[PDB]
Design a protein around this ligand. Sequence first.
Ligand code: GET
Lengths: 292, 159, 72, 172
Amino acid sequence: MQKEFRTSAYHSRFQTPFRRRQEGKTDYYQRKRLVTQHKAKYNSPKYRLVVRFTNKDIIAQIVSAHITGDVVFTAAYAHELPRYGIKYGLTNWSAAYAVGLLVARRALQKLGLDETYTGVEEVEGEFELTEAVEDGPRPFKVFLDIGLQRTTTGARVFGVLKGASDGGLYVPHSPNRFPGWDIEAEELDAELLRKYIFGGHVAEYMEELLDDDEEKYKSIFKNYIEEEIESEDVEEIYANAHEAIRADPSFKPTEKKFTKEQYKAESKKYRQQKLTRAERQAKVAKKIAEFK
Amino acid sequence: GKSRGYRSGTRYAFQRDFKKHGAIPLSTYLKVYKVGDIVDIKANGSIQKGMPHKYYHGKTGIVYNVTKSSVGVIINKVVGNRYIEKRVNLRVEHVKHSACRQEFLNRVKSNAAKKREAKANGETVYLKRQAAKPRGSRIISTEGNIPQTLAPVAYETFI
Amino acid sequence: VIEGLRRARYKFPGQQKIIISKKWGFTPLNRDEYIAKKTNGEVIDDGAYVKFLSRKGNLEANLQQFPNYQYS
Amino acid sequence: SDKSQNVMRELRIEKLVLNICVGESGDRLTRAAKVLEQLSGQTPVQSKARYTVRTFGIRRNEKIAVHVTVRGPKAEEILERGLKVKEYQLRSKNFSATGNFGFGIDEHIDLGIKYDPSIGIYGMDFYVVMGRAGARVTRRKRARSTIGNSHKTNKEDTIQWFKTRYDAEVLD
RNA sequence: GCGGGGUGGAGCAGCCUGGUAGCUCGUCGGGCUCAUAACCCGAAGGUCGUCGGUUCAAAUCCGGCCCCCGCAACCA
RNA sequence: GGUUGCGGCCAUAUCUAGCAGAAAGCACCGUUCCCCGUUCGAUCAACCGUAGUUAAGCUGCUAAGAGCAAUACCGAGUAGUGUAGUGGGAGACCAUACGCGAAACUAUUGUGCUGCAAUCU
RNA sequence: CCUAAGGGGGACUCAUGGAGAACAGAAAUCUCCAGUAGAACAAAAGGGUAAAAGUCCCCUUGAUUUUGAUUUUCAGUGUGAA
RNA sequence: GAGGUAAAGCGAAUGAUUAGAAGUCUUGGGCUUAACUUAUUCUCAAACUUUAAAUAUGUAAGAAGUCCUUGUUGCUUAAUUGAACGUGGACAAUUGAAUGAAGAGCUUUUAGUGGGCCAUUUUUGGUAAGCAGAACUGGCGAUGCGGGAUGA
Ligand SMILES: CN[C@@H]1[C@@H](O)[C@@H](O[C@@H]2[C@@H](O)[C@H](O[C@H]3O[C@H]([C@@H](C)O)[C@@H](O)[C@H](O)[C@H]3N)[C@@H](N)C[C@H]2N)OC[C@]1(C)O
């Protein structure tokens, strides 16, 4: 009764979106405004802090765009954080701060701007931008790029932002999306933000859950129990981690348990190779024969 | 009454290509233009700002000015019995590099390299291009290629 | 039919020709081509017209639609 | 495993929605909003007429209906009260092609709600939305996609699940 | 080439300036009368020439088409 | 070779219908004290990675598959067209000379390639 | 003609069809699926636009100040507009 | 580089359009009658279109160039990055396609004119016109001479 829709003309005239748009990974409107440079700043690149969250990891890359594709300047991951003394909550707000700090220190060390622009060393949760030194190189400037993630006050992407800013990178931002901002009296509760930097929210949850529902506390906080880490011991974890990141931010790659050819040979055992022309033609001849 | 508005007559010239609507690929925004570059002008109908007039659609010119989001381009326009130098401000979506110039710069490099090779060898080479010359003499073998005779064919209808 | 068309010609301005086609009916096939396609099971009736065999597309539907097809 | 017996294929309620469409505003709409708030424990939302119709006495962009979406344990509680009013008896036609279904109730005090003169008696529409784990892939912002053909709900599975799980009869 | 008209059975409003179709006569039911007219109390009856369009809303505002009645068609 | 993040070109990448998928990754997945957003912790936010699952996403393979792309002693040197003549023809039009040259049609082939970084049985 | 129908940001997706839910029906509101734009964008027509240029929410006044350069019409004068 | 005319196309989008056929009757009539759906079928478009010529059209083919080193600046970069203009050094008659060039550049001043018309081709209105209106080129006007008997 109603015309069948998926016709050959519908498919023929269909215009497919950009490949990374149909995968739902790239916002090209935002990417255009983020990437395009002043034409009178000819080959000078704009740098993006790409901050991405998975269900288990935090990805922070400093990226510049080019015709053949983006080029990574430095990258940091939350799964690197065991090396600095953080083992659990690898998607905390606080792990986000640590990864931002790591990527900032790593980039400034790659640039030679370590001793200049050491950032905020005594962290108190205040809002602060990296200021330029007199008669010196200007701070490394990067722009925050959060992809498809929503701008809500308290979100972890701005935790990576805060870590990177305190690490010495100049990242323009306003404090009104940090945990601690109050929209009525528009100022920042620096105490709440500095609590969020050092895992204070998780520490409070640990204490209250231990004192109220011990069995749920047992299931949720199993790793802290087995390592014997009470709610009193979290802030020193994050402070020691920050000190360790500041002392040695160089990238260390995993010592590969297998070389590339072993990985390749072991994965080629599992890829269905396509048929050939003759094989498909023989299948058609047979399927005709059975139909007779 | 007649109508001679700014975009009159542009029904097809300013259309996007078939199945080429929508977002501009970012390569358009990553190109770098310098004063003296030679650029082709092509209006993009989806970018209403910084558009060329229909006259400059399909014209090629010299870049003379570089601003935040656009280039200034010099075009020569026949007005009566002489050319007038025109200066048009165009956002980069409406601009593209000209490929003939890249070819010519390549030839400049090749001529220099060949001249240097000859100078190191001790001789002189010719750098001017040449038009296609008439072919020289040749011998054609008939091995497995005996001349085969053709004739005009009779008329036939097929209706 | 030739005389019938001969009479209709006088109703038109200018000149017209009456041509006998080599093809089977209103089909685009020559008479021998149509007989070959018919005896090979590659045509079926569709009212006043026919449908021809396609060697493209879903093989199962092609085989069902022309059951008498002699695959060669 | 490639098996339909897998535990991520277990059917379950996504949401029950509670519709009360009265053809006007003021007292009746307020009282219907109140009955939904009492029943559901939630504040409902009012819907507007998308265009004036004089045959219905309805007028464009005017508050007419009210509804509320309930998901979780309270959804199945309200559903089981609704089916005790329906006497655990439904028809085949009640089930949509996708695998959802619903029914209606002519009086809320039949759902164990005490009569109040301040509210009166109101009918009510139920509609339960079925689903399986992984429905997020069609809901989330990033990397949104569709659902595999096997993982889709349908009328057949929804009816079988309903009869087995509620000990109820579905009349063809 | 223009101009007006087209709305209950009849003759007319309402258009303008969108949101309700009003008037007189007529028709139908009951009454008064021996009966009829007059008179008295009640009731029906125009989707607005027609096909579209716009508008949240068309008798109305915006075009095409159909019927009716008219004005202009001059200088040799 | 697999996978992820950010991409370039933007269907050889799309679409339908089946099937398969080790390792890691990704994912679904658990919870609601805290920042936050909702009629609804569904989406958005946050917390745990702890209880589970490859079922779905994702990846690959299959289809005389649709679409798309490419090719050609395919059609066709056809249609059209620049130049020429005191060429032909009542004319509409047509041929010839020196040049350019389609589309539909037909048949066959293919079905993403790739940059930077990280990681993996 | 418009204090938004101007500016910025955000979230969402439109016409239409199919299948379902008391009164409820062709048309009320509620649900899911399909949906390349078949909608919408003040007004003619053409062009343009889908994580938007459409719909809805939040904040606003860049519809401001100074005076040059340029494009169209063109005498390369004026006006209008950009 | 640009273009959307000619041609082409419509079992490709929009719009127009002839004929059956198989379904659907859950949708309205009288086994039908129309509608609907599917695969087909005949024919079209100045104000339709995926495709798409020929002719015509933009630009380049160096000395005001190329390469090396490093000067200026209040602009620009995270920068010792660039941008623009340079010093010093090198590359010589093939200084970077063809053919031509009673030479190239520059200025002032002023006449007449501002009714046109014809031909091939493209083309609009009109039944058409030695009619009316456009496009490119050549002409007549302004021009005799040989030919077309005669004739812008
Ligand atoms: C193939 N396209 C052709 C195009 O080339 C051109 O054809 C001309 C043709 O018309 C000329 O012919 C024309 O001119 C002559 C004479 C006055 O020169 C007349 O006698 C003739 O009637 C006239 N049609 C002919 N002499 C040369 C072709 N190239 O014009 C006609 C056309 C059909 O468009």
